[PDB]
Amino acid sequence: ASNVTNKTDPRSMNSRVFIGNLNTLVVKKSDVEAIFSKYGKIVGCSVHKGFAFVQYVNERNARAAVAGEDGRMIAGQVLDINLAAEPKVNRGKAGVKRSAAEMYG
RNA sequence: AUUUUUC
Structure with a gap:
């Protein structure tokens, strides 16, 4: 897939996947477009330090991986x-941080 | 090598 994931269109902002706290010191772009391609057609992908991004064709594909891979382990993290x-x-x-509305009370 | 953008 392509190397582009930073558009701001009203349907590209929700056809995208944010991937934080990522093991970016062992993963690569060719891994992220191979771990999220099982949940939708990727037409763009990028990787950074501590996070990465994936660009699907539609929102339905994003909900598939945002609920299909969230909380999973990769490379040990x-x-x-x-x-x-x-x-x-x-x-x-x-x-580890919490919201002021989601605190322990 | 470590959470919103081109590895």
Whole structure:
């Protein structure tokens, strides 16, 4: 698949997958487009430090991997997968941080 | 080598 995943169209912002807390020191672009291609047609993919991105053809494909791979282990670590326009995590760089509305009370 | 963008 292509190397592009940063569009901002009203259907490309929800046909995309965010992949945080990723084992980016063992994974590669040829791995991310091979771990998420089982849940949809990838037409763009990119990888960075601590996170990566995947661009599907539609939103249905994104919900397939955002609910099909989220919380899975790869290369010995777990990755936090979510819709690219529906962030809920505090981006605490470890997943240990909580929201002021989701605290222990 | 470590959570929203071109590895």
